Amino acid sequence: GQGSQEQGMGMDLYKTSKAAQDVWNRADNHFKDTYGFSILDIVINNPVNLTIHFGGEKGKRIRE
């Protein structure tokens, strides 16, 4: 369950395993195409402020 979460958890596994690459990327592609952020970016970099923008036809669908 919750609690135990560090910067770049399981990213060692993402680099090697083909099956891992499938899971993260397909999710990541959805996060960009629906909620307009990279979940990878979040895990790898752990930023402090993230700004979601709703410009353009694709932006509109994410805002809705």
Binding site: K32, I52, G55, G56, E57, K58, I62
Partner: protein, 145 residues
């Protein structure tokens, strides 16, 4: 470009055209790549194209008309190429604007032109009109058509 007809087209003309078309395309070029790099698909920059309606009606303007007409390609390339999510086109057909309050050669005849039921603009008035193109309503339109 003043007093440059077809025969007198040279260095000056080509250089201006490079400014007034090519580099602007390359600029729209540059912004697209840098936005596609960082995976920013949902924040398009609105390009305000200075349009002329007088596409060579006057002459002696050299490659002015050619530059200003070539920009109209962007209204079709936005549909047909893969940069619609990074840029939008907002072509501003600019009318008469009176400059400063001295005899900049064209201000004298402004009055006469307005007696044909035409209206000429102050700098501040035309600015407002262009700032009109950055209102969140027309922002939405750019991002559809």
């Amino acid at each position: 470009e003043q007093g440059i007809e077809l025969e007198h087209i040279d260095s000056k003309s080509e250089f201006a055209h490079r400014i007034m078309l090519t580099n602007i395309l390359r600029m729209m070029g540059c912004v697209k790549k840098q936005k596609s790099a960082r995976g920013i698909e949902t924040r398009p920059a609105q390009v305000i194209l200075p349009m002329s309606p007088n596409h060579g009606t006057f002459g002696g303007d050299g490659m002015y008309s050619e530059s200003k007409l070539s920009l109209e390609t962007l209204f079709n390339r936005w549909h047909s190429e893969s940069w619609a999510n990074q840029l939008t086109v907002c072509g501003a057909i600019i009318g008469w604007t009176r400059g400063t309050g001295l005899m900049s050669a064209n201000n004298i005849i402004a009055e006469g032109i307005e007696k044909m039921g035409v209206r000429t603009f102050s700098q501040k008035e035309m600015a407002f009109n262009l700032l009109g193109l950055l209102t969140p309503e027309v922002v939405e339109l750019c991002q559809k058509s």
